[PDB]
Design a protein around this ligand. Structure first.
Ligand SMILES: N[C@@H](CCC(=O)O)C(=O)O
Ligand SMILES: N[C@@H](CCC(=O)O)C(=O)O
Ligand SMILES: N[C@@H](CCC(=O)O)C(=O)O
Lengths: 174, 135, 116, 49
């Protein structure tokens, strides 16, 4: 009796530690403070340049990491970055629009945290081009008429990806 | 009038090569959101155009030691393209050297990453379940 | 920073920055799931269950998922915090070299559109 | 398993050859793990270098 008393006490105590401990990347800060999970960005794009120029401590620390490890963690395309997330312990700094497309099609992937910054995509022109203001007005017309939203839905069609123990003792009973 | 030269870059779902069995030529090779945008702009503004992939495969950044740009941004600086129609971010450093329309889409940088009855046999080791039965 | 660019009278009021904040039998039905209470409704079987309930309840009493200072806010992110944009309190945090306050500034700056 | 695991603790001491390249790597590094390690090694230098 004293023997079984100790055992059942041990089982209970031990089972508690596994439940106590049972009770996680959520932000850039979480990446910046570690190195086991590598991270990076598209070389020679805007995301890279944001980190390269930033004076914000979290982002400056991330740039120092990406610069150090750049032959491995800076990639030449979003496609390459995605393949690194899928095939290694790697988080990819990517624009949110593109993340929305990727996560609707790769259901094992997700966006971590929110937006780090805010920017737009625009049609580029040489400095001084007369087309710049004409394209602005055309874009505003397309937005207001609903055509840009229709185009996003079209190219953004990803109707996919969502956004015990005690039992074992029952079977041995029956 | 002269067709405008439009620089772009492959990036799904903005700009892609169309799938087909017959070979495709010229502008007919491409599809995507930015291709549909370009088609709409061309109809509203009354221009024709020729799509060309940026030869270096880059969006564009400035070299820190020699100060030269690359990518689509450099194509515009050098007047080798009339327009860049692509998911091209409007940024401080770029707006000092090229011009941009107001945005057709808004976004931000974020992070892409990943998301047993044997939990009953673990607490008390298999070796222990055995001995407790032998005893 | 302001006295370097404008000129102030001596004070009419003295003050400092501080923090403004706010001041179930179902915790018994949680440890052992409603689904489990059902199925449970033989000695070795009940032994395991009561042991599980005890162990699990202990976990609950340990973690159990009190703010007294800026240090307590700085160490966490569940409770957000901020300040008036473009005022003296914001600028105090923005300029501070003191570890607690520099950590708070990093948080406020990150989340500025929501917390300033 | 890693430098990160050493950096996060102080029970196990760590160090390097004084006035060599490894020491200088830590002394110069901006990478958080390695800068934390340098602070430890510098503090405890008479014993760990
Ligand atoms: N859209 C970016 C490239 C992708 C990125 O930097 O995340 C650019 O205009 O440079
Ligand atoms: N009284 C402050 C504004 C309020 C604050 O910063 O808390 C000032 O002079 O800027
Ligand atoms: N080989 C090193 C010395 C040994 C070390 O620093 O680990 C040097 O050239 O400084």
């Amino acid at each position: 009796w004293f023997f079984t008393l100790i055992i059942i006490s041990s089982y209970t105590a031990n089972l508690a530690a596994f439940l106590t401990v049972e009770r996680p990347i959520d932000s850039a800060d979480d990446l910046a403070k570690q190195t086991k999970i590598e991270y990076g960005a598209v070389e020679d794009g805007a995301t890279m340049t944001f980190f390269k120029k930033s004076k914000i401590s979290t982002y400056d620390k991330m740039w120092a990491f990406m610069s150090s490890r750049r032959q491995s963690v800076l990639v030449k395309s979003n496609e390459e970055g995605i393949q690194r997330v899928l095939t290694s312990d790697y988080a990819f700094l990517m624009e949110s629009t593109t993340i929305e497309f990727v996560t609707q099609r790769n259901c094992n992937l997700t966006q971590i945290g929110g937006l780090i910054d805010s920017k737009g995509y625009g049609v580029g022109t040489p400095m001084g081009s007369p087309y710049r203001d004409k394209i602005t007005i055309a874009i505003l017309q397309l937005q207001e008429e609903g055509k840009l939203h229709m185009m996003k839905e079209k190219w953004w069609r990803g109707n996919g990806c969502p956004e015990q123990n005690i039992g074992g003792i029952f079977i041995v009973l029956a | 009038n002269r067709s405008l030269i439009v620089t772009t870059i492959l990036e799904e779902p903005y700009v892609l090569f169309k799938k087909s069995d017959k070979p495709l030529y010229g502008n007919d090779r491409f599809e995507g959101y930015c291709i549909d945008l370009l088609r709409e702009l061309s109809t509203i503004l009354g221009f024709t155009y020729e799509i060309r992939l940026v030869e270096d495969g880059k969006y564009g950044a400035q070299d820190d030691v020699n100060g030269q740009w690359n990518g689509m941004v450099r194509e515009l600086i050098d007047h080798k393209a009339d327009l860049a129609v692509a998911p091209l971010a409007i940024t401080y450093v770029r707006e000092k050297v090229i011009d941009f329309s107001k945005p057709f889409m808004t976004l931000g940088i974020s992070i892409l990453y990943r998301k047993g009855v044997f939990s009953f046999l673990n607490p008390l080791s298999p070796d222990i379940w055995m001995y407790v039965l032998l005893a | 920073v302001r006295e370097k660019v404008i000129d102030f009278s001596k004070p009419f009021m003295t003050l400092g920055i501080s923090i403004l904040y706010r001041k179930g039998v179902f915790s018994f039905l949680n440890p052992l799931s409603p689904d489990i209470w059902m199925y449970v409704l033989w000695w070795f079987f009940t032994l395991i269950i009561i042991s599980s309930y005890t162990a699990n309840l202990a976990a609950f009493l340990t973690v159990e998922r009190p703010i007294d200072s800026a240090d307590d806010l700085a160490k966490q992110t569940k409770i957000e915090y901020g300040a008036v944009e473009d005022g003296a309190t914001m600028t105090f945090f923005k300029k501070s070299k003191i570890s607690t306050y520099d950590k708070m500034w990093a948080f406020m700056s990150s989340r500025r559109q929501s917390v300033l």
